[PDB]
Design a protein around this ligand. Sequence first.
Ligand SMILES: NC(=O)c1ccc[n+]([C@@H]2O[C@H](COP(=O)([O-])OP(=O)(O)OC[C@H]3O[C@@H](n4cnc5c(N)ncnc54)[C@H](OP(=O)(O)O)[C@@H]3O)[C@@H](O)[C@H]2O)c1
Ligand SMILES: NC(=O)c1ccc[n+]([C@@H]2O[C@H](COP(=O)([O-])OP(=O)(O)OC[C@H]3O[C@@H](n4cnc5c(N)ncnc54)[C@H](OP(=O)(O)O)[C@@H]3O)[C@@H](O)[C@H]2O)c1
Ligand code: NA
Ligand code: NA
Lengths: 351, 351
Amino acid sequence: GLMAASTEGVISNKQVILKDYVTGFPKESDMQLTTATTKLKLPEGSKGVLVKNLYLSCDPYMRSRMTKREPGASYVDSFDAGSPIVGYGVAKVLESGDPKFKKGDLIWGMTGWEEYSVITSTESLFKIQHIDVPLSYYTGILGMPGMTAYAGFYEICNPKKGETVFVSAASGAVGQLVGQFAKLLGCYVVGSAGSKEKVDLLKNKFGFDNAFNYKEEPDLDAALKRYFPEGIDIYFENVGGVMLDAVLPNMRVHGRIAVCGLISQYNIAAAEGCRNLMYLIIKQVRMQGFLVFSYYHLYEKFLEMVLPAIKEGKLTYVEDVVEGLESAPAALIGLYAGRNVGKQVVVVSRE
Amino acid sequence: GLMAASTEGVISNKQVILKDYVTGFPKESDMQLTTATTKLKLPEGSKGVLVKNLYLSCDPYMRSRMTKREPGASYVDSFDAGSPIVGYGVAKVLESGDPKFKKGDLIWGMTGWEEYSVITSTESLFKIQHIDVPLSYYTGILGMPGMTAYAGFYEICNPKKGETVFVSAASGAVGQLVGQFAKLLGCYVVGSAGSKEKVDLLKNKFGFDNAFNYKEEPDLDAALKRYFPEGIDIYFENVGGVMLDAVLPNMRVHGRIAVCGLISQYNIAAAEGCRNLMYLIIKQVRMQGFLVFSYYHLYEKFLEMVLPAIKEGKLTYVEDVVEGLESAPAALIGLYAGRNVGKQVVVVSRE
Ligand SMILES: NC(=O)c1ccc[n+]([C@@H]2O[C@H](COP(=O)([O-])OP(=O)(O)OC[C@H]3O[C@@H](n4cnc5c(N)ncnc54)[C@H](OP(=O)(O)O)[C@@H]3O)[C@@H](O)[C@H]2O)c1
Ligand SMILES: NC(=O)c1ccc[n+]([C@@H]2O[C@H](COP(=O)([O-])OP(=O)(O)OC[C@H]3O[C@@H](n4cnc5c(N)ncnc54)[C@H](OP(=O)(O)O)[C@@H]3O)[C@@H](O)[C@H]2O)c1
Ligand code: NA
Ligand code: NA
């Protein structure tokens, strides 16, 4: 077989399309791998960038964008059926209408699930300077998940030396950093995760004081009392559901719950009830939700702290890396089954 | 018929006894009116007071004390089966072992459901000085409920001029004050209550901007959008249950929920689930429980503000007054049916 090159400079652009809006849990077959065509040229008048995508993030929030809604009651618009999935990634600039960015610069920000994207505005892109770390880190510890852990722990939890900290989904992109931040502060830290592998990772890689497999614990209250005989000062909440109900009676007086996520609720049409809210009164607890995008003014301050800590080996990170856009649908769905061990990354292209 | 006076100075002391611990909703027949005897003499060595009870408070928390528990996981010990109900009241000192208190002084604090009580310690009693108000006010606006409204609204809600405020159980002991405090601050204030009488009281007596009868609203979300077309900055939560679920999607960004009470949950063995907690994240809401007893250091500051406001007619109060200890069981149970119109008081004796 033989394929002539295009005399109009057309090349192939593989894409992951959302075929149609999703009800309940997403399936691989809700997405379609396709091959489009592109002339690698920016639209006339573009103030944006034409990029080659290198790495894509799989992030839990992305399921919410697969449900059809009008712009509102969500912080962000639905995906468009028939168009590529969009999400955070790391890309190389091919052409720019903004002279801040030149060919060969590396960026992170919202991009398409495709080999090549046009991003119409640069105002929400970050130009990468420090490349003495794996570039995939700018989807996790040096991107949106790392900023989430930094904001949620240091700005919402009011953490103090000697406090007790519980983290759910603790081996994941956000949780693995919260627990390290807490350990470095001098807190007692425990995490919950969904397998022996992830429990062992918490104790051995991340230095949590203890951890347990929630899927093997018939009695979550008894598990939390095993590790917190005098209660929990801070709950960093990533999951919601039965774990939140089990936590509430185990909070300390003036305890805090940072409500980062509620991933156990993301795929069911009607959420489970939280039943132990009386303990917010009895223990005088502050339960506070937050959105990372309200804290990006702190990003440069965050990088000034975390880059040298990674270099010094004070902070570490575990990524789950899968190869190719072809892998991306299964990697995204896998978040809701705990398939990922650490932060889920898709490698579209290393260069 | 003829009854000789006792040659040992014994007199009759009517009491309301808890016959046995309560499961589910309390009944009048869970309590027993009885006549004991007393020699109005303090025990040898007593550092406390012998008092004549004048007024008793019916307060929602009292149901929790009718369930048997070990000392813990509740901020206070169960009632004793076979002994008088205890709760906040207003009393006259007959005899004292503490010379701070003399015969004829008026106090408020925790006392027995009886004509005469021995209170073993004075450390938690307040000696009343200002008697140019109804003495019953020291069970409500000048007692524990008034302190609750002051602390919860001014210390937990971070209220600001022009903010939107929603109050549940808004015609009750606490809620009727929160809404007045909010109106005086320049907030837009709406309240929910369980009857037309109480709705009309909110608009006409307390100057709320609006109010509605939750028992007549099939769609609580639609009712809240009627009164809050741009959402709720502060929810002062007294009820929990379906009202909390309806509020959450109607919160404004950086909205606050002061969790004072959850009375819809007090009598059912398993609480209803709160299902809309995702909105704590989407709207970045602070949902914070508190206990009035952590704020009694502010009581003298509270009285310096509220006494002149009551005298000037800036603040008003509505009490539901029933006559006699014989009325007390039905008045207490009535709280869980909304029988009370305003703060529920029992008159044991006017002097
Ligand atoms: N507020 C914000 O701005 C913000 C930003 C970023 C992330 N978040 C939230 O933070 C949380 C963590 O995100 P992440 O990126 O770090 O994800 P992640 O932990 O790397 O991956 C998701 C993990 O969720 C766990 N999980 C999935 N379904 C579950 C269920 N039904 N019950 C309990 N655990 C379940 C799984 O771990 P196990 O194997 O341990 O079950 C899975 O590996 C998510 O809720 C996300 O939405 C919020
Ligand atoms: N955190 C603290 O330190 C503290 C201190 C004091 C009080 N509190 C709490 O504050 C709340 C109000 O106390 P309060 O003394 O002012 O009581 P209150 O409002 O004077 O009386 C209770 C009222 O609750 C309402 N209610 C009863 N069952 C209900 C249900 N199933 N659904 C909805 N509403 C229901 C009724 O009003 P409607 O006719 O309008 O239904 C009833 O009149 C209570 O939850 C109490 O426990 C907390
Ligand atoms: Na501690
Ligand atoms: Na407002």
